[model samples]
Target: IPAFHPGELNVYSAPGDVADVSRALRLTGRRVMLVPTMGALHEGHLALVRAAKRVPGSVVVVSIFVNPMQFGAYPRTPDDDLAQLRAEGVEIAFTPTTAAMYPDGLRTTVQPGPLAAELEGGPRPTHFAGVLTVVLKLLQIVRPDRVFFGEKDYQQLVLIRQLVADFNLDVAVVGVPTVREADGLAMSSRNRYLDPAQRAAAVALSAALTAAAHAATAGAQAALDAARAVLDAAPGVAVDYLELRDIGLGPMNGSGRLLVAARLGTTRLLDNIAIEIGTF
Candidate 1:
């Protein structure tokens, strides 16, 4: 129960409080848009916020809950995220506590479908469960007319779509395209973790994927080899996986996606690009 200002960014730490405020705003004819993220605001995230703001009558509600269940880093910086949200004209920031989110201690959690056992999910077995649980909770709490996600994590985006459809959730799930650096590396919070030399080598992840996309005009095998050549030539990059599958993460049927994951030192980088199979 904190003070809330209408025009400025209103920060709410309690789920129930934010839900009530979101419901009130929706009743007053404001279309609420949710952009859920772990608390590390970057340009890629701001792109999602921008998409939400562009919607007619949109009142964006950005949630900064670094889900413990996601099996990940605790980006411990709140003031920075708050400042960026305020600067971006976000109306509501749901910064719920762990206790506030899962008071019951995960008695009943979301179980993602079979798709959760592949690609990113293969390495991170329970990753999407944590993701969907928090995402579903946020959807329930905020009850936004639309939710925004980035296509940087393609598998996660697909699984989220499945969540919306399977759960019969009413909100529209909007996915913004992956934002990249000027040098072609996909913008990510983890990029900061790379040291200077590793950072220079890290571009190979995106370079490889983009090269695969270009070589895709030849064929699938050629695409994969081209991407592999790029990664193999890089000094510090250790290739994790370079795969080509259908956009749906299924067996390729003419159309496909080229996904690459590599390690530049200790940090693992993931990236993917769309492939048209033959035509450039």
Candidate 2:
């Protein structure tokens, strides 16, 4: 439930290239929550925010930055997007310019190893590396007790979790479930890019996930085939990869993850459903 008031949204622009988040937390003695985004807030993102509030952090900070290493840049000015987060009960907002972050211009970057080379990272070689770099910077800058991420980006969620453990960054990385449409299509900010016809066809992504999930008990191969059949039967959808990977992205025959990446018209879509083995 949305439990925060819009009037409580506090816009903080700490006076330095690198903000001192600890200073703010030290005064309140409240555990902190950080929810990062690339902008264009969706219901899924809102769901993450609401979840963060349930955990009742002393403070919650949401950052809307489009890493130059990633997709489109969201401007730093307070706009409708910021206004929406305000109404949704976001306590702190940070929008630092690229110059503010990478003042030296790509001098340093975090490289996520082969664990990232599967699924989504397969196509975008350095995407996860870029992702980790920014996230690491944010973690240090925010020093949050916990961080929130949507499970829709499953691989990213796992990678970030590993990142904190490997680096011993005393922060928690938590994944919220993927929020979806009534038809079951996983909600995405990019879903807005789809045309009407493509939107109708996009439900196949979720359908494929559901089918594969249902077939997972039969075996990995059965799950894959069931998932493929859904996409194959859907008109105008192109498959990139339909896979079943263990919790850690390894090989799994049962009770793993069934994920898909495909295109409807020109929009690339991703969706997944978790599977549990009821029996052998």
Candidate 3:
């Protein structure tokens, strides 16, 4: 018999401890899946959980740790508030600091070649580095047969897939569909930082992606033009980088990926929708 719930959701601290936990649950007898997050759970996160459930005997383990090392350059989200909300919403919370994970130092940081240098790479230069470091650490700890990520952060997903293959990690990295609200804004934890007015303005992200996706279906350049128009309309949005690129983060020939990052007030919002311009 399994020690943890089979069809139900469960949260685990860090991926570091997942191997032991799965061993305790005798997970080797059945398949396992892992969904990693930085707390502040949203529908996009839930969508990943749902994907994990589709696999038989899949012990879905969600990691809810807000890594401090990654936030070294950026301000840390209020821990007290995050903890309170996490307790109420998440089944498990992982609390580990940079010192704990890398007392010596992070010797192996995964860099996503050219892809990491573009859209997300420009503003938050070290963002993907921190993300890949922590994710690889978690993957080592959890050792899940399959790991899931959301397509909303398509660039991160692409980088992670590269990390897995590059490092030869023994797990399948898959992406789930992006989740959105009625107004078309991609659901995100950072959305909490948005005030009433800023929240309303944030809808431009989804609107832009929607336009890009539609345009791609019509014609390649049409899609790129449509995305640019949406960004132009939202002057309040401090545009970061709105570009279309291939799955490999190379220049978009026609069919590839769309990524957008913008700042509303003080908050940074990112959303991406996959697109295919022409035959790859």
Candidate 4:
């Protein structure tokens, strides 16, 4: 694939070759912006590319590798189908299969702090570990001046931010605002898994978060109760865990996050909205 232009988008299949790309860009005195994704491009993914363009001297590079290590035992989705959705405004770096990512006995792995074991962690045990490791690899390969992530995946964003801080990675991790549809569904790659009825049902996830954010102004418990009620209304949806946590991934006292995970059909969806509360 050709290099990404200021406003033009292109997709690349070999993100591992980004070092050479970055080196070439540096030789021309251009700074780079890396936006990583697991395919299934949506509005949220495009927002990252737009954010990348806003950065000074940035040459945006997006990766579309559907990392298997992160998926764990979850039923895999076909990457070819997802790749067809690639827009013309972003450069994609598609990597080889997961088996190739860690050929055999890959020794190095990125570890998260105790926080990694909470929320999504408890359900997807090896998820963040795989995420951190691959992210570290991307950072090394791309060597970008800045990297962008959407706030829709709040916990994932928090984990990645901390991982960079702890490891002293050279790239700056920037958070982009969550993109949503007109009906308030937080955009995600997994949203593609939902059938027509399932997609309609999935709106409850965002509605719940919006209600939680509003109710949290009164108190945290109220917010939790409101959010839970929304999930409860959808009997077909299987609730994983609903939590209110501080911005730093700590338990919430007043201001915190209202995070929810539920399944619409067999597709598990996660969404979070921030809230500010006044405690008694």
After TM-score superposition, the amount by which residue 53's alpha carbon in candidate 3 deviates from its true location, in angstroms, is: 1.9
Q: Model 1 — which ten-residue stretch has the worst lDDT? A: 67-76
Per-residue accuracy of model 2 over 1-280 as CA lDDT, tens digit each:
1132333775654424225544445456777788898777778988888888777545668888888875422333448768888787777777777777787877788878688877887778878888999999988887888899988999899899889988999987888999999999899867877888899999999988887777767777777888888888898999888877888777874467777888877678888778764443
Looking at model 3, the pairs that clash are 254-277, 255-277
Number of backbone collisions per candidate, in order? Answer: 0, 0, 2, 6
Descending-TM-score candidate ranking: 1, 2, 4, 3
Highest TM-score model number: 1
List model 3 lDDT by residue over 130-221, tens digit each.
88888988787767788899988888888898899888999999889888889988888778789988898898888988888877766778
Please report the candidate that would top lDDT against the real structure.
1
Compute the lDDT of residue 169 as modeled in candidate 2: 95
Supply the TM-score for candidate 4: 0.86
Using all chains and alpha carbons, the TM-scores for the candidates as numbered come to 0.96, 0.91, 0.82, 0.86
Cα-lDDT of candidate 3: 0.73
lDDT of 1: 0.89
**What's the C-alpha lDDT at position 89 in model 1?**
91
Q: Is candidate 1 or candidate 3 better by TM-score?
A: 1
lDDT, model 4, position 144: 86
C-alpha lDDT of all candidate models, in order: 0.89, 0.78, 0.73, 0.76
- Which residue runs does candidate 1 get wrong by more than 4 Å? 1-4
- Candidate 2 TM-score, true structure as reference: 0.91
